[PDB]
Design a protein around this ligand. Sequence first.
Ligand SMILES: COc1ccc(Cl)cc1C(=O)NCCc1ccc(S(=O)(=O)Nc2nnc(C(C)C)s2)cc1
Ligand SMILES: COc1ccc(Cl)cc1C(=O)NCCc1ccc(S(=O)(=O)Nc2nnc(C(C)C)s2)cc1
Length: 263
Amino acid sequence: ADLKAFSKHIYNAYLKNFNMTKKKARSILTGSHTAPFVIHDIETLWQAEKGLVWKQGLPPYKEISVHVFYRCQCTTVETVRELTEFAKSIPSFSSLFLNDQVTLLKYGVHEAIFAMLASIVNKDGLLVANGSGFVTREFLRSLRKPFSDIIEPKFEFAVKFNALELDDSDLALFIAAIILCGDRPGLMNVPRVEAIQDTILRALEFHLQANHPDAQYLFPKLLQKMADLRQLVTEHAQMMQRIKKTETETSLHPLLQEIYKDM
Ligand SMILES: COc1ccc(Cl)cc1C(=O)NCCc1ccc(S(=O)(=O)Nc2nnc(C(C)C)s2)cc1
Ligand SMILES: COc1ccc(Cl)cc1C(=O)NCCc1ccc(S(=O)(=O)Nc2nnc(C(C)C)s2)cc1
């Protein structure tokens, strides 16, 4: 009863904080939705940059690989900010000690970003420019190493994740559970974190029961994906650290350096 209303509240805050929903993404990738402009090479990328409207700008005078790397960074930073406002809409999150709130966001944001990233990806590429662009996976592998390497595993994770067929209402709860994880390092009051988590997790288990009646082992399967995202994020961080040391003409945004750093 209260769980059902809890889940609805989390879902609304998710809808309030993130513009691209899985529902919208899927109705675009599948086809009242015009087909997105396909970015498959440098020319189409340049045209997409000139023609489409994006949320922002980037450093000028950069080779393509690096330029695309900064676009992604800029998008990551914006989602970190959306996730920060969303976690503030999670009942009690704002009750935690300041250090804990920070610690949860620091260690959980990329996990949430990668779970949500799947909504806009298929095996062939992903939506960009808020759904008006579609960048092909082949075009991305055609970029310079090590930049062509960052994304492949996100694609691998996404295609497996998408087979679970979650919808926005499931994802909103999944994302709160990821942020309210009691296993982060340096947590001060973990019992207080796990108390808020258990509520979200109870709301989720029940929610999936209602929303996926003919899917028996979905709940635990979801908790396992959380394990997958954590490994995905550890790898991603190492990739960034190496690019940082290996690519002198590139730099990590301040807020992102502060995240990849400690982890
Ligand atoms: C691959 O993403 C893009 C590729 C080309 C163009 Cl024109 C735009 C985007 C974009 O807007 N991405 C925003 C969403 C996004 C953000 C981060 C990531 S990532 O976590 O994989 N980090 C990456 N950093 N650089 C990357 C490039 C060099 C592939 S991937 C993937 C996707
Ligand atoms: C902004 O954070 C700081 C603010 C004052 C001082 Cl004395 C130090 C830091 C710092 O070392 N933060 C490192 C971690 C961090 C860096 C940047 C960002 S942000 O860019 O997302 N927010 C900012 N807003 N304004 C900023 C500049 C103009 C100070 S940074 C978040 C987190």
